[PDB]
Design a protein around this nucleic acid. Sequence first.
RNA 1: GCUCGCCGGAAGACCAAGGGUUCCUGUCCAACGUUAAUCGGGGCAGGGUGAGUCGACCCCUAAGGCGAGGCCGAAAGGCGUAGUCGAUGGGAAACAGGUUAAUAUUCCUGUACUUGGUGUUACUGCGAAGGGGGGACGGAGAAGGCUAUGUUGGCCGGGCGACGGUUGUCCCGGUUUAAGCGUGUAGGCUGGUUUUCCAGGCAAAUCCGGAAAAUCAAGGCUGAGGCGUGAUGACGAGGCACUACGGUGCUGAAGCAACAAAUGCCCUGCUUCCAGGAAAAGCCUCUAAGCAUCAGGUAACAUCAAAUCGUACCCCAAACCGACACAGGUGGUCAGGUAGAGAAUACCAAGGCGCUUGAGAGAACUCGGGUGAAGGAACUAGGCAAAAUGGUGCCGUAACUUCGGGAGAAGGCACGCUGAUAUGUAGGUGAGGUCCCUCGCGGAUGGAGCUGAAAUCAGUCGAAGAUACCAGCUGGCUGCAACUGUUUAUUAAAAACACAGCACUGUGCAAACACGAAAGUGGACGUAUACGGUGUGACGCCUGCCCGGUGCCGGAAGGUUAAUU
RNA 2: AGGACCGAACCGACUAAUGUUGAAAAAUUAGCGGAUGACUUGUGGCUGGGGGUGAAAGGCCAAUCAAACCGGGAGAUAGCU
Lengths: 46, 271, 93
Amino acid sequence: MKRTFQPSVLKRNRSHGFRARMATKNGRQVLARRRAKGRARLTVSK
Amino acid sequence: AVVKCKPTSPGRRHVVKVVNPELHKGKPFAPLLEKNSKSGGRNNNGRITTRHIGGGHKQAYRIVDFKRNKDGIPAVVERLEYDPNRSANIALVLYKDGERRYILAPKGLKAGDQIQSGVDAAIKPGNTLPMRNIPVGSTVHNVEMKPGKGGQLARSAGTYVQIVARDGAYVTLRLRSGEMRKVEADCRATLGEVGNAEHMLRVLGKAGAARWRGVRPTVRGTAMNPVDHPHGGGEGRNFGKHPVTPWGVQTKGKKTRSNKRTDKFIVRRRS
Amino acid sequence: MIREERLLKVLRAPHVSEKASTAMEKSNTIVLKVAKDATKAEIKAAVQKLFEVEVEVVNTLVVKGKVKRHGQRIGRRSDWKKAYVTLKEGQNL
RNA sequence: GCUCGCCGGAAGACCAAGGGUUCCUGUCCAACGUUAAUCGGGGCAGGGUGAGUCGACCCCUAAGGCGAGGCCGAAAGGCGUAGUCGAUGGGAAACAGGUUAAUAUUCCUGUACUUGGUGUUACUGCGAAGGGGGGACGGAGAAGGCUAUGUUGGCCGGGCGACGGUUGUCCCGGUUUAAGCGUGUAGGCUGGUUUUCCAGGCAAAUCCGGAAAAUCAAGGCUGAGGCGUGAUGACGAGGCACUACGGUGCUGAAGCAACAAAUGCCCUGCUUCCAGGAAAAGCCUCUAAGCAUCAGGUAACAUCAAAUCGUACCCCAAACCGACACAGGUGGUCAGGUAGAGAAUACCAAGGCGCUUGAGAGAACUCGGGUGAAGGAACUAGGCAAAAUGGUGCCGUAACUUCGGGAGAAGGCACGCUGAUAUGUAGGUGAGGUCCCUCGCGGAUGGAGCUGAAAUCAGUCGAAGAUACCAGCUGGCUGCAACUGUUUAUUAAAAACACAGCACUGUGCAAACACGAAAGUGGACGUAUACGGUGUGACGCCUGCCCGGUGCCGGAAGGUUAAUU
RNA sequence: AGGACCGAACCGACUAAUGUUGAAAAAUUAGCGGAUGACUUGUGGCUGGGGGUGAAAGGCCAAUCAAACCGGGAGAUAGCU
Ligand SMILES: NCC[C@H](O)C(=O)N[C@@H]1C[C@H](N)[C@@H](O[C@H]2O[C@H](CN)CC[C@H]2N)[C@H](O)[C@H]1O[C@H]1O[C@H](CO)[C@@H](O)[C@H](N)[C@H]1O
Ligand SMILES: NCC[C@H](O)C(=O)N[C@@H]1C[C@H](N)[C@@H](O[C@H]2O[C@H](CN)CC[C@H]2N)[C@H](O)[C@H]1O[C@H]1O[C@H](CO)[C@@H](O)[C@H](N)[C@H]1O
Ligand SMILES: [Mg+2]
Ligand SMILES: [Mg+2]
Ligand SMILES: [Mg+2]
Ligand SMILES: [Mg+2]
Ligand SMILES: [Mg+2]
Ligand SMILES: [Mg+2]
Ligand SMILES: [Mg+2]
Ligand SMILES: [Mg+2]
Ligand SMILES: [Mg+2]
Ligand SMILES: [Mg+2]
Ligand SMILES: [Mg+2]
Ligand SMILES: [Mg+2]
Ligand SMILES: [Mg+2]
Ligand SMILES: [Mg+2]
Ligand SMILES: [Mg+2]
Ligand SMILES: [Mg+2]
Ligand SMILES: [Mg+2]
Ligand SMILES: [Mg+2]
Ligand SMILES: [Mg+2]
Ligand SMILES: [Mg+2]
Ligand SMILES: [Mg+2]
Ligand SMILES: [Mg+2]
Ligand SMILES: [Mg+2]
Ligand SMILES: [Mg+2]
Ligand SMILES: [Mg+2]
Ligand SMILES: [Mg+2]
Ligand SMILES: [Mg+2]
Ligand SMILES: [Mg+2]
Ligand SMILES: [Mg+2]
Ligand SMILES: [Mg+2]
Ligand SMILES: [Mg+2]
Ligand SMILES: [Mg+2]
Ligand SMILES: [Mg+2]
Ligand SMILES: [Mg+2]
Ligand SMILES: [Mg+2]
Ligand SMILES: [Mg+2]
Ligand SMILES: [Mg+2]
Ligand SMILES: [Mg+2]
Ligand SMILES: [Mg+2]
Ligand SMILES: [Mg+2]
Ligand SMILES: [Mg+2]
Ligand SMILES: [Mg+2]
Ligand SMILES: [Mg+2]
Ligand SMILES: [Mg+2]
Ligand SMILES: [Mg+2]
Ligand SMILES: [Mg+2]
Ligand SMILES: [Mg+2]
Ligand SMILES: [Mg+2]
Ligand SMILES: [Mg+2]
Ligand SMILES: [Mg+2]
Ligand SMILES: [Mg+2]
Ligand SMILES: [Mg+2]
Ligand SMILES: [Mg+2]
Ligand SMILES: [Mg+2]
Ligand SMILES: [Mg+2]
Ligand SMILES: [Mg+2]
Ligand SMILES: [Mg+2]
Ligand SMILES: [Mg+2]
Ligand SMILES: [Mg+2]
Ligand SMILES: [Mg+2]
Ligand SMILES: [Mg+2]
Ligand SMILES: [Mg+2]
C-alpha cells in the first residue's frame, strides 16, 4: 500500500523552501503571515 | 515497392509496408542534423492545445534546403535518405565547391543525378527556377509564396503544383487541394513531383503502429458525458444533436476560413 | 602566511579517549578538538608554531552534537571538529 | 553450551532515497516493550565517523526554471533575447594485506596513479568569444573468443573412527594473491604516402569538404583475455604458548592441472529492421586579430599542492512511507552446491533467524488441511468450491479457415536401476612429442588425459520409475466484441473505451483549431499523400427510398430591417 | 519476424474463502491475466479548480471530487428540528 507522502528533501525544498517562497509575491505574503503569527519555523527549509 | 505482411499474428495480418531498397542504410549526415524534442501538444502555458499528440519515436531534425539559393553551381545527388520528419524522402547532394545539403527527393531522382538552381538552369526534375522562367503548364513542387522565403507548397510525398497561367508579375497555380492561386512570378519552384507516391498505400495494421508515430487515441464525443463534450450523454446510444467540435462549433460542412488579407490571391476555392 | 592570532584561535583543546591514546602510542598521532572553521593547513601551522613539533599530515572530521534532554526539555550540543595530527616520528608531543 | 527446527534469487551481503545517533561501551528497570526482564532500537553517561583517487562540491549541458535590456498587460503581473541555473546524463586519478568495542579503497604496511603551480634544462610559432573532428548515442538477433565461478584430479597437512568393515580406487581441510607497469593476442574498423588546384566551412587556415594526378600493396586505429613483473612478499593448514576463557604472541607445508561455464567482458562491436534512435563541455586539430630575439608551446627533471563538506548506524526494514516494535509499500548491486530448461521448485552452503505472553486440556462450534464404503452433479441460481489433467521423446490428429491457424486438437506408446555394444560410445576439449616457418601470444600432424549424450540388446526390483516438489482438464453448439490493449485507486474488467480500417467535413499557411485581455505559444521547424473535428469500428458481401422539419452550403433580384443622417 | 506462444522476476487484479471493534481505513491464502511491448520502473520537470488531466468510469487531481484544500465575506440563510 503506497501512501500519499513519499519524502524527498530536494522536492520539499524546491516546492516549499525559503527561496521558493521568496520567488513569488504570494510566497512573501505567506512568510509575512507566519512572521506575524510568530512561528518558530518560517518554512520547511529547516 | 508495396509489400503485404503475412498474417502470422493478428497485428501483422493487415500491415502493408512501403520498402525502398535505394534508401541509405547508414546514419544521416551529422553536420546537417539538429535536435527536436517532443511537446505532447502543449504550448508555453503547459496546456494541451492540440489533442492526440504524445509519445512516439525519438527523431533528429534534418536541415532541409527549401530556399535552394546556390545558383549556378551544379550538385550531384550523393544519396537518398529516410527523413522521420516528413512523408517525403530527402536527398543528400554535393556541390562542386564541396558543400553538402539536403533537398526533397523528387520522383525519379537517383544517386549520381545532376541538379541546379537559377534562371539559367535546365528544365528537368530537381532543378529550381523562378516561376517566371519555368514554362507554363509545368509540374513543379516546393513552391515559394514570397520570393526568397523558401518553398512552402507541394512538399508532401507525391504532391505537385501545376502552373496554369501567367499574367504579368503573377502565375496562377493549381494546388493539390484543387485550388487556383496567384503567386508572384518571381517565386521559385522545383521541377517535378515529390517522390514517394507510395507513401499513401501503406496500412499501419495495428494500434501500436499509430502509437509509434506520436498519435494518441481519439475518444469519440458520444462516449463522453454532457460535461465533457456537447455530444456526451444518453441512456444507451443517443445522439440527437447536430455534430459539433469539443468547443461547440458545427463540424460537418460549416466553413471556418476568414482571411480578407489574402482573399485576393485565391482565384478559385478548392470545392 | 597564517597570522599568529589565527594560529592562537585555531586549536581548542586536546581530545582524551582510549582511541586517542592508542593513536598516540601506535602511530604518533595527537587528537585535538579544533575550531569548526579551521582548515588542515591552519591546524598544521598552528601545531608546528605552538607545540614546536614537526607535522606529517592532518586528518579532520566534524563531530555532530548529540540531542540530549534536561528535565524533559530537548536541547542539542554543538558540532565540533576533531583533527588527527601525525607527527614526524621523533617529536613526542 | 550442546541439540532441534526455519530462510538460503533470502528471512544472506552492500547501498541510494528517507531517517538522524537508533552505532559501541558502562550503568538502571519508574514509564515504554501488548507477559516477566537481569535484556532493549527504553533512561542516563561516556565514546565513535580520519580521503588528491569513494561521493558531493566542481567543469558541461537535457527537460524545465529564472531572466539585463525588450515586447505585452487596469495594477499585481505575463512572455521572452543575450545570459544564468538545472541531473536522472558527459568530464583526472588506488589497489592488495593488517587493524578498532565501535571507521576504513579514509588509519597502518607494501606497491601505485592523476591534475595543477612554480624553478632549472633543452628544442620551438604561440594565439579565440571563430572553423573542423570527436564526445555521440535505436530495437532485435547470432555467434565466436574469454573470464568471474564451479567440479574433479594432483599436491600438502591431519585421521584410522562409540556399532559389522575402513592402510585404502578410504576420510576431512587447504590448495589464495590486487591495482599498477611491460607485451600485444582472438576479434572489429580502415587502403596508406605525396603533389597540384578550389564559387564550401560568417574571414584565414597547413585543418575539414571537393577536383586531378603519381606512387607504395602493407600501414594505421581499436581490442577482451593470456603471459611476465608487482610477489625472496602477503595470506595460508594446522602446530609451538597465553586468555580478565570475550580474544591474543610465534611459526607456518602445498599453494598446481584438466574440464565445465555466465545474463559479466571483447561488444558504443557485427548482422538485420523500421518506428530512424540527446546536448554541451572536457579532448584533438586549424588558424584570425595580436605578440612577435618577450609571451606562449613540447619534452626531462626537482619541488610544492590537491582545499571544503559526507563518511557512525538501519536501509524489503522494529530505524524509511503506513497513528503501532503494524502479515502492506519501497529503486539499484552480488548471485555457491545437488537435482533442474531455469533467477521456477525441493534439500543444503556462507550467512542469518525461531517472528516479545506462556503452561495445560484434547468438548460443541469456527478456521486451515488429510482420508473415505456404495453412488457420482442426484447439490446449486450456477459443477461455487473441490477433485481431476499436468514432463520429455515418438506415433497420430477433425470440422472450419483470412491458408497463418484450429493444434499441445483429440488419442496413444516408452520412461527406474544394472551389464554389454563401448572396463565411457558419438560428440567436445585437447598435453607432451614431432615437424616447419614471414621465431611468435605462430602454423601442420598427432592423439595422451579430461568431459560426455542418446540408442539398442539382456537382466533386474517394486502395487507404482515424468514416483517427491514442480507441472494444460478435454470435447460439442451458440450470443457479443475482429484481434493485443484500456477502464469505475477502495463492491461493476464487460458486450463498455481504444484500435487498425472507412467516410464526411474544415484548413492554402501569418492554415483551420486550441491556451492566452495581449504579447506570444502549440498545430509544426509540418504544407492538402499535411493537419484538425466528427461519426463508424479488422475482414467479406453491402449500405436502399425521403431535402417536407432542424442544421449546414450556395444565390442575391425583390420585401423587411440597426447605428448613421 | 512478431502489440507471436509457454512460463519466473516485474506489472495487474478474474474467482473463492478468511478478515470485517481486521495483522491491514482495501489485505492474506489458494487459484488467475500480461509478461519485447499501445510494456514496466527510478530521478527530475510541466499542466491548478468551472481549472487541469482522462484508450471516457463523472474517472483522478495528497485515505477528500457532479466542481480539491486553506483562510476570509461569516454569526450567510434556515416559514425547519
Ligand atoms: N595426504 C593425504 C592423502 C592423499 O593425498 C590421498 O589419499 N590421495 C588420494 C589418491 C587417490 N588416487 C584418489 O582417488 C581418486 O582418484 C583416482 C584416480 N587417480 C580414482 C579414484 C578416486 N577416488 C583420491 O581422491 C585422493 O584423495 C585425496 O586427493 C583428492 C583430490 O582432490 C581429494 O579430493 C581428497 N580430499 C584427498 O583425500
Ligand atoms: N515441447 C513439447 C510440447 C508439446 O508436447 C508439443 O507441442 N509437441 C509438438 C506436437 C506436434 N504435433 C508435433 O508435430 C510433429 O508431428 C506431426 C505428425 N503428423 C507432424 C509435424 C511434426 N512437427 C511436434 O513435433 C511436437 O513438438 C515437440 O517435438 C519436437 C521434436 O522433438 C520439438 O522440436 C519441439 N520442441 C516439441 O515441442
Ligand atoms: Mg512538518
Ligand atoms: Mg486528432
Ligand atoms: Mg479514429
Ligand atoms: Mg471523434
Ligand atoms: Mg472528443
Ligand atoms: Mg459514459
Ligand atoms: Mg453542453
Ligand atoms: Mg436506447
Ligand atoms: Mg593521509
Ligand atoms: Mg573528510
Ligand atoms: Mg551456542
Ligand atoms: Mg536516544
Ligand atoms: Mg545496540
Ligand atoms: Mg513490561
Ligand atoms: Mg539505548
Ligand atoms: Mg525587466
Ligand atoms: Mg520568463
Ligand atoms: Mg535556458
Ligand atoms: Mg552551467
Ligand atoms: Mg548525476
Ligand atoms: Mg560497521
Ligand atoms: Mg578460469
Ligand atoms: Mg538478461
Ligand atoms: Mg558504513
Ligand atoms: Mg512483535
Ligand atoms: Mg513489519
Ligand atoms: Mg518490488
Ligand atoms: Mg526459490
Ligand atoms: Mg508473537
Ligand atoms: Mg481440534
Ligand atoms: Mg466443528
Ligand atoms: Mg472439531
Ligand atoms: Mg476440520
Ligand atoms: Mg474435513
Ligand atoms: Mg481430498
Ligand atoms: Mg466416496
Ligand atoms: Mg470408491
Ligand atoms: Mg463417472
Ligand atoms: Mg440439478
Ligand atoms: Mg434440487
Ligand atoms: Mg473452480
Ligand atoms: Mg439467445
Ligand atoms: Mg473486446
Ligand atoms: Mg468482425
Ligand atoms: Mg461485425
Ligand atoms: Mg487499473
Ligand atoms: Mg472497483
Ligand atoms: Mg498561431
Ligand atoms: Mg480533405
Ligand atoms: Mg478527432
Ligand atoms: Mg460504436
Ligand atoms: Mg443510409
Ligand atoms: Mg507476447
Ligand atoms: Mg496469451
Ligand atoms: Mg505467458
Ligand atoms: Mg473487481
Ligand atoms: Mg495471490
Ligand atoms: Mg453515467
Ligand atoms: Mg484520493
Ligand atoms: Mg459550484
Ligand atoms: Mg454578510
Ligand atoms: Mg450558523
